[PDB]
Design a protein around this ligand. Sequence first.
Ligand SMILES: [Pt+2]
Ligand SMILES: [Pt+2]
Ligand SMILES: [Pt+2]
Ligand SMILES: [Pt+2]
Ligand SMILES: [Pt+2]
Length: 306
Amino acid sequence: TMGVGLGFSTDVGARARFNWTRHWVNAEGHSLGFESEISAPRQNVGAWYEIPLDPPLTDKLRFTSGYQFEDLVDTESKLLTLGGEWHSKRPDGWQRVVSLNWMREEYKLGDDSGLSSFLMPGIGYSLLETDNKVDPSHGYRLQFNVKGAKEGLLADADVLHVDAMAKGLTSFAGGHRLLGRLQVGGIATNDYKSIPPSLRFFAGGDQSVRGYDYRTLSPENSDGDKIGGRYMIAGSVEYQYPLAERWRLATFVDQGNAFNSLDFPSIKTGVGFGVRWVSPVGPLRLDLAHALDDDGGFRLHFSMGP
Ligand SMILES: [Pt+2]
Ligand SMILES: [Pt+2]
Ligand SMILES: [Pt+2]
Ligand SMILES: [Pt+2]
Ligand SMILES: [Pt+2]
């Protein structure tokens, strides 16, 4: 299968995606792959190899490697990664993923720098339940993921990173939709300074807290630079009114922040309204949001997501 993509976002700007899938390499049903995405603030390249186990569809190994450059707000990171995964799914729909990932990261947090490396195991569970694929009328997504590391065991620090997300949709009356969204993240450690950007948390953006620019909701250090938070929350509620076929009208309320203290979350609130269009290039969403907290102006968001 082949793929090329063009995109735009308020978050990262113009964007190009590429995919290369090779669906059968050998008699055991192995799959080969490549993918990349190029945007001004972020560029990455990736490869993957797949081996079907038994049952062929729900159990498999996927070996992967990757590179990602990221220059966002006041932090930069060159991230190199290798990994092995074992996917397995029970009839509920609960997908477990057992992973072993090694990574090396060159990073700049504010006015400093680092290079650190980790071999970290992770486990994930997912659940996805919807009615159909171009017109979903109700459904949900549950995602849970924990990874961790022990210093000495190829790690500059001890790490316990946890992230979880939940999406839900209901249609009621004559096609009136309600959309619900929650996301939480946390990392526990005894050496926060050795902890690179990829393991820290940021908030704000199209799919996070609308009304605020991408990854700007964050703790700052002594000198006033957004260096990344130990924790995050992001929640959103959206009402959609079907206005025409392929056209919906949404209004929303968002809340969220990235923060270092459970006692001072400093929750930010965004509100707004937008237009949704299921176009022949994808679900496009164009939003107008007024940030109510901090120093709030008005903001234009563009995105092409589910
Ligand atoms: Pt999977
Ligand atoms: Pt990692
Ligand atoms: Pt998600
Ligand atoms: Pt602007
Ligand atoms: Pt896209």
